[PDB]
Amino acid sequence: PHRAELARQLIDARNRTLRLVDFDDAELRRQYDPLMSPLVWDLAHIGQQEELWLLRGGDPRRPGLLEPAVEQLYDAFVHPRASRVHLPLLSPAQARRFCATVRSAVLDALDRLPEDADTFAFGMVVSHEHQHDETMLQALNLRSGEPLLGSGTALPPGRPGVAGTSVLVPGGPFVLGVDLADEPYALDNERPAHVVDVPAFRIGRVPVTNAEWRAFIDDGGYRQRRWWSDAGWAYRCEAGLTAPQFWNPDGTRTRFGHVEDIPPDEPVQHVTYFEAEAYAAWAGARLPTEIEWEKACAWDPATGRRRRYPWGDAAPTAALANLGGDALRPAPVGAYPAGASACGAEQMLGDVWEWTSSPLRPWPGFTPMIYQRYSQPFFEGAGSGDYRVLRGGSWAVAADILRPSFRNWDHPIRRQIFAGVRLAWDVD
Ligand SMILES: C[N+](C)(C)[C@@H](Cc1cnc[nH]1)C(=O)O
Ligand SMILES: [Ca+2]
Ligand SMILES: [Cl-]
Ligand SMILES: [Cl-]
Ligand SMILES: [Cl-]
Ligand SMILES: [Cl-]
Ligand SMILES: [Cl-]
Ligand SMILES: [Fe+3]
Ligand SMILES: [Mg+2]
């Protein structure tokens, strides 16, 4: 954009990272849960990736500041999450120094770029850092002990008449995905824009709420195999799933270490894919595909055009959506009437990542970005296991890095992510 805007975005992302590691060294070296890296791992990994993509042209053979064997400690493919706490990692002080040295060079490089030069990698790195910021928040939410973070900033109230209800998404062709001409920092798996015919379906006006989930529990939803897939039931049994994560036996939840009542009208959060599909079956519904989800979010059947955001082309604001990390929770359903998509689906962007039934797959004409291993290894059948796509972002996602076309994904057994559920239905 303006190089000044990119600098602003990089600085904002780093400010966020540094808030998330503004704790004593022992905290940053802890493993909060075997699913998660120590925070000091993400810190150095953020710098290493910034250096690689912005200072080294994505070519590991070009020299970097770290010995290659030290650099490789931050290769997520080489080192499983649980192992990272035991690796001979850079100290927090070393990691901060490294990140700052890299950043000084990156800001200089951005100054020196020729006019009209391509800046894609800079936006890709902003996205990368913010996504690790959300990972670090997942870790801090898993941490046992007295809270390190506050309970979150104020959110708007919800309103009646939206929970449980659905909106119609009329059938026909729509444009899935985006091109760089329209979204200059869209990641490779969002491209290219192409037409898909999506039959009529209905989608939830708002996500499934906590009170609705409690009804599933109360009716024996976790005790009735018929709602679950074979794999989902097996996992429910193996893992002993009886409620969303962080829901306590006494009816409270624990959120960033804060014990509190469970708000009835918030979107349910911290459920697996398997739980989501079981709830949906029990409720008389199903999960959306990600293609259905994106049509509900972005398509305006009155103009036969995509919108940039569900509400139109205005930049996200606190009045339109719950984004950016400060709330530490999703908002009550109905809190953002002005953020509705053309079909009336609300809170599509922000609040909770929403599970879909789609595996990650390339759009026709997919081509990888400079970080070639960002999407490709996780496509269906690529050999990294089973994934399902999640859409829309959560409360933790930076507005700068989110689009209707953005695709998250995870293994269906994961629920430490800030994920919930929106229902869908066939139309006859
Ligand atoms: C798209 N997710 C969120 C699944 C990715 C983003 C990512 C960060 N560094 C490489 N990729 C992930 O956390 O592994
Ligand atoms: Ca969402
Ligand atoms: Cl990983
Ligand atoms: Cl990771
Ligand atoms: Cl596979
Ligand atoms: Cl993975
Ligand atoms: Cl899995
Ligand atoms: Fe990464
Ligand atoms: Mg309306």
C-alpha span between 106 and 101 (Å, rounded): 9
Residue type, 320: L
Please identify, by atom number, the ligand 1 atom nearest to the C-alpha of residue 410. Answer: 4
Rounded distance from Cα 341 to ligand 9 centre (Å): 9
Residues 126 and 229 in one domain: no
Are 5 and 184 in contact by the 8 Å Cβ rule? The answer is no
Pocket test residue of 131, 369, 408 for ligand 1, highest count of atoms within 8 A of CB = 131
101, 122, 151 - which closes a domain? 151
Q: Give 313's contacts (C-beta < 8 A, 6+ positions apart).
A: 307
Whether residue 199 is preceded by a cis peptide bond, meaning omega within 30 degrees of 0, is no
CB 232 within 8 A of CB 280: no
Q: Which atom of ligand 1 is nearest to the CA of 132?
A: 8
Contact 203, 296 (CB under 8 A): yes
Pocket flag, ligand 1, residue 128 (CB < 6 Å): yes
Helix (H), strand (E) at residue 409: strand 408-410
Residues 123 and 185: beta-carbon distance below 8 Å:
yes
- 3-state SS, residue 195: strand
Q: Is 79 exposed, middle or buried (0-12, 13-18, 19+ CB in 10 A)?
A: middle
**CB of 391 closer than 6 A to ligand 1?**
no
The answer on 245 and 162 residing in a single domain is yes
* Residue 348 CA from chain centroid, whole number: 12
Residues 12, 13, 15, 16, CA torsion sign:
positive
Domain end position, chosen among 151, 175, 191: 151
> Tokens in use for 114?
């020729």
Same domain, 82 and 112: yes
* Number of separate domains in the chain: 2
- Backbone φ and ψ for 199, nearest 5 degrees, come out as -55, 160
Q: Which domain holds residue 4?
A: 1-151
Please tell me the number of the ligand nearest to residue 80's CA.
3
12/57 same-domain check? yes
For the Cβ of 41 lying below 6 angstroms from any atom of ligand 1, the answer is no
One-letter amino acid of 33: D
**Is the same domain home to 177 and 43?**
no
| Same structural domain, 170 and 99 | no
Residues 99 and 124 in one domain: yes
Helices (H) and strands (E) in the chain, counts: 10, 13
Q: Is 120 in the pocket of ligand 1 (CB under 6 A)?
A: no
Helix (H) or strand (E) holding 293: helix 290-298
**270 phi, psi to nearest 5 deg:** 65, 50
Neighbours of 182 (CB within 10 A): 12
Residue 230 and residue 256 in one domain = yes
Measured CA distances, 181 to 186, 192, 193 (Å):
10, 10, 10
* Cα–Cα distance for residue pair 193/172, rounded to 1 Å: 16
Is residue 256 within 8 Å of 147, Cβ to Cβ?
yes
Residue 198 is given by DSSP the state E
CA–CA gap between residue 148 and residue 360 (Å, rounded): 35
CA 372 to chain centre: 20
The residue from 101, 128, 151 where one domain ends is: 151
Q: Are residues 164 and 127 in the same domain?
A: no
Q: Are residue 42 and residue 124 in the same domain, yes or no? A: yes
- The experimental technique behind this entry is X-ray
Centre a 10 Å sphere on the Cβ of residue 246 and count the other Cβ atoms it contains. Answer: 18
Resolution, in Å, please?
Answer: 1.6
Residue nearest atom 11 in ligand 1 by C-alpha distance: 374
Non-local (6+) Cβ contacts of 352 within 8 A are 207, 267, 268, 269, 330, 392, 394, 395, 418, 419, 420, 421
- How many whole angstroms separate alpha carbon 212 and alpha carbon 423? 12
Residue entry with tokens 């700068």: 400
Instruction: Judge if the beta carbon of residue 32 lies within 6 A of ligand 1.
Output: no
230 lies in the same domain as 353: yes
Same domain, 107 and 179: no
- The torsion angle over the Cα atoms of residues 21, 25, 28 and 30, rounded to 10 degrees, is -160
The b-or-e profile of 273-290 (16+ CB within 10 A means b, else e) is bbbbbbbbbbbebbbbbb
Buried b / exposed e over 300-334, threshold 16 CB at 10 Å, is eeeeeebbebbbeeeebebebbbbbbebbbbbbbb
